[PDB]
């Protein structure tokens, strides 16, 4: 698979410059200028057949042209069959994502569907990453999605939601891989927010609450357009890390971990959470 990476190709008078994340080149060949311009107007992935055709049309040797494009940071070639063949976004604000499927292709991210949580009869295919994004959080929504899809072969989930002044993105929940679920995450954050000066969350006050039907909403600051935009970018980059055009590799010790962002300071904190002792995700 050939991935087109971020770059610009700019021109003034007889001067043409290529600028990528890796390098900058004063371009002196008209054919390669043409190739770069066509690549710049395409989104993310290009068939090697079309790349070859593009190079042939500009009378450029395919091997030498490809080597130039790869070494300068215009394209890369990936080989790996990925773990989730598709992503879906399920949300209570699907309109926030109404352009995401088409935009995010140029980051190499395949999102097949934006699904409104209000939909009855939601279907998802094999080996799909399900991103559940909630502005108006309720634990029952997460429980419904798990109840419907946890048994889907190769499924995984990511959940995103707001808590106090933060945007939270849970670690990837993969039943196949045995990683912690949303409830493992939200209990870790609720514990940390208690002013107990204690890591341990359990006491008789907590045990008595665990008698009631497990359900909750979460306090959070009111969202404006800028908080939504920030969130939108974090979602995109996270999906990109997992399933899209990889620009920066992640260390194996934190690739599937949670990502939390303080909406005031804009500082991110990426943290692996443990399985919550009272959660049954491990037993399913």
């Amino acid at each position: 698979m050939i991935n087109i990476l971020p770059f610009e190709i700019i021109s003034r008078n007889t001067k043409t410059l290529l600028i990528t994340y890796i390098s900058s080149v004063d371009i002196t060949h008209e054919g390669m200028k043409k190739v770069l311009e066509s690549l710049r107007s395409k989104q993310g992935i290009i068939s090697e057949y079309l790349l070859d055709k593009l190079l042939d049309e500009s009378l450029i040797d395919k091997d030498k042209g490809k080597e130039f494009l790869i070494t300068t940071g215009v394209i890369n070639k990936t080989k790996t069959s990925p773990l989730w063949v598709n992503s879906v976004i399920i949300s209570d604000v699907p309109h926030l994502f109404s352009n995401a499927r088409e935009q995010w292709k140029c980051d190499g991210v395949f999102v097949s569907h934006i699904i409104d949580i209000k939909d009855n009869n939601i279907n998802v295919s094999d080996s799909t990453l399900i991103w559940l994004h909630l502005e108006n959080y309720h634990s029952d929504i997460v429980k419904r999605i798990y109840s419907k899809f946890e048994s889907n072969p190769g499924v995984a989930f990511i959940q995103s939601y707001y808590l106090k002044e933060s945007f939270r993105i849970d670690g990837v929940y993969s039943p196949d891989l045995g990683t912690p679920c949303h409830f493992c995450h939200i209990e870790r954050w609720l514990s940390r927010e208690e002013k107990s000066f204690r890591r341990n969350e359990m006491s008789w006050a907590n045990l008595l609450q665990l008698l009631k039907k497990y359900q909750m909403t979460l306090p959070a600051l009111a969202l404006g357009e800028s908080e939504r935009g920030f969130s939108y970018h974090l979602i995109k980059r996270r999906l990109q890390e997992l399933t899209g055009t990889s620009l920066v590799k992640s260390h194996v010790d934190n690739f599937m971990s949670s990502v939390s962002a303080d909406l005031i300071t804009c500082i991110l904190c990426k943290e692996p959470v443990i399985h919550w002792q009272a959660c049954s995700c491990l037993e399913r």
Partner: protein, 396 residues
Amino acid sequence: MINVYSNLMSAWPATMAMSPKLNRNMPTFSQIWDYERITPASAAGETLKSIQGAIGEYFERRHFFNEIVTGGQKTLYEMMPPSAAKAFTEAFFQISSLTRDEIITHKFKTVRAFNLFSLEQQEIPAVIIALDNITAADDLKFYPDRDTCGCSFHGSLNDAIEGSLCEFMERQSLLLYWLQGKANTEISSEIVTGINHIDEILLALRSEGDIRIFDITLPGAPGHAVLTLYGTKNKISRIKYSTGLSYANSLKKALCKSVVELWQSYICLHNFLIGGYTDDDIIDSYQRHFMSCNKYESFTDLCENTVLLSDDVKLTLEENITSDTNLLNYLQQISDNIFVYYARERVSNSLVWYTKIVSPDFFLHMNNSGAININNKIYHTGDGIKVRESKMVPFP
């Protein structure tokens, strides 16, 4: 895990703990220990249900054993309507050697109750409900043997009543089965449920020894009381016999709960025995009796004396036409004299509920080696197996 420890002078018990386990497919076991105020309370199953169950078992047992205060003192006929008072009199007349005259003039300590069907408020004798020997000490001559049959604890009155009804069905079904040897059907001992933790237990039991699964539901009743039985001849096994029982509307649900109840009794006694704990550590006479029944002959004695109404061993767990008839209608046809003892306590902005379903027209408790109302609306002396009428059922 959990591991919440409380000071001796705390309102709360000494220790709650959820046990670690290596196998993700075994049930979670949670336990509360509170010195010898009560015997340790536990539950097993899905993690949260096990935690919820241990807490509920603790609240329930603490209430009935340690916490009842009676609301006055009245004769049976002052305390309730006349036909209820008559049924109690006939129960008490079999339990002690005292005369009907002595029974109807005695001033019993009272507790609040309502009739299960009419919701008519009344009182019933406290001596039936309180497990300690102080609460209704002066009434013990009338009713010396007490237990926790029909007792439940929950966060809603309807759920507590439902829990009490299930236990009532369980125990009444078990006593009739014990006395007569009659079951409705057998479920295949090779049954596969699809529920990972249930199948894990069943396979382990099948590998260690043998099992039998019987539907022992009271005849004509809806729902399903499922009795699971285990026994082994294997020398190095500490548990030679165990049992589980549960009643639910769903046959599958009843079977699954029954299997986990068996595992719970199996593992508690197993851990007692490999711990090397002495007999002085056993303070409960039902637990002492159950421990003396830990032998293969308990298993064979039950299985060889069981007669099935249906010869076909069930290979699937579907309901039938009787399963979803109305349980309250069914019970009321047998007797109008079924009462709900109740108590409640504020916890934050909620109420928790303690209930016990009691009827003098059914067995008042489950020890037929003690002082019991053997003649009632579901059994009369001589109906079943004679030796069983004087022996306690081998059930914890």
